Amino acid sequence: KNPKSDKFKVKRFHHIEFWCGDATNVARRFSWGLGMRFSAKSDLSTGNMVHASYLLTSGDLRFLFTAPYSPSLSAGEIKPTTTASIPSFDHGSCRSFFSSHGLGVRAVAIEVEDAESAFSISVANGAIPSSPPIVLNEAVTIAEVKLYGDVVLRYVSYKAEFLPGFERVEDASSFPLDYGIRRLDHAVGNVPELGPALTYVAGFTGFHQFAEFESGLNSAVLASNDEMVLLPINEPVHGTKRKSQIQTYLEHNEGAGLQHLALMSEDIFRTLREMRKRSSIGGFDFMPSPPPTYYQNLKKRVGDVLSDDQIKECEELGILVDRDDQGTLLQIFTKPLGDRPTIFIEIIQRVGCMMYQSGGCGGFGKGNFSELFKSIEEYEK
Ligand X SMILES: Cc1c(C(=O)C2=C(O)CCCC2=O)ccc2c1c(=O)n(C1CCCC1)c(=O)n2C
Q: Find the DSSP H helices in the chain.
A: 23-34, 91-101, 115-124, 194-205, 245-253, 268-277, 292-295, 299-302, 308-317, 367-380
Cα 247–Cα 282–Cα 348 angle in degrees, nearest 5:
55
Listed ranges 97-105, 164-172, 302-310, 358-366: which one lies at the site for ligand X (CB under 6 A): 358-366
Q: Which does 254 bind (CB under 5 to 8 A by kind): ligand X, Co ion, its own copies, none?
A: its own copies
Residues 6+ apart with CB under 8 A from 309: none
Q: Which of 20, 52, 86, 262 is the binder for Co ion (CB under 5 A)?
A: 262
39 is a site residue for its own copies (CB under 8 A): no
* Residues in region 209-228 near ligand X by CB under 6 A: 219, 221
Task: Work out whether 346 is an interface residue with ligand X (CB under 6 A).
Answer: yes
Q: How far is CA 73 from the centre of its chain?
A: 32
Query: In whole angstroms, what is the distance from residue 267 CA to residue 348 CA?
Result: 9
The answer to the question of residue 15 lying near ligand X (CB under 6 A) is no
101 annotated as ligand-binding: no
Indicate the residue among 204 and 249 with the shorter CB distance to its own copies: 249
Smallest gap from Cβ 26 to its own copies, in A, equals 5
Range 58-97, binding its own copies (CB under 8 A): 67, 69-70, 72-73, 95
Whether 51 has a binding-site annotation, put simply, is no
Q: Please indicate if the annotation marks 346 as binding a ligand.
A: yes
| CB nearer to ligand X: pick between 121 and 287 | 287
Does 175 engage in binding with its own copies (CB under 8 A)? Answer: yes
Q: What burial class does residue 92 get, using C-beta atoms within 10 Å of its C-beta: 0-12 exposed, 13-18 middle, 19+ buried?
A: exposed
Identity at 122, one-letter amino acid code: S
Length of the chain: 381
> How many Cα neighbours within 13 Å face the side chain of 34?
32
Q: How far apart (Å, rounded) are the C-alpha atoms in residues 271 and 185? A: 15
Determine the interface stretch with ligand X among 78-86, 169-177, 202-210, 361-369 (rule: CB under 6 A).
Answer: 361-369
Helix, strand and coil content of the chain, in percent to the nearest 5, comes to: 30, 35, 40
Q: Exposed (0-12), middle (13-18) or buried (19+): which is 213, by Cβ within 10 Å?
A: exposed
Q: Which of residues 234-293 bind ligand X (CB under 6 A)?
A: 234, 245, 260, 262, 287
343 binds Co ion (CB under 5 A): no
Is 369 a binder of ligand X (CB under 6 A)?
yes
Do 333 and 287 contact (CB within 8 A), yes or no? yes
Residue list, annotated binding site for Fe cation: 186, 260, 346
For its own copies, the binding residues (CB under 8 A) are 20-26, 28-33, 43-44, 52, 67, 69-70, 72-73, 95, 98-100, 102-103, 172-175, 177, 251-254, 280-283, 285, 337-341
Residue list, annotated binding site: 186, 260, 346
For Co ion, the binding residues (CB under 5 A) are 262, 346, 364
For ligand X, the binding residues (CB under 6 A) are 186, 188, 219, 221, 232, 234, 245, 260, 262, 287, 333, 346, 364-366, 368-369, 372
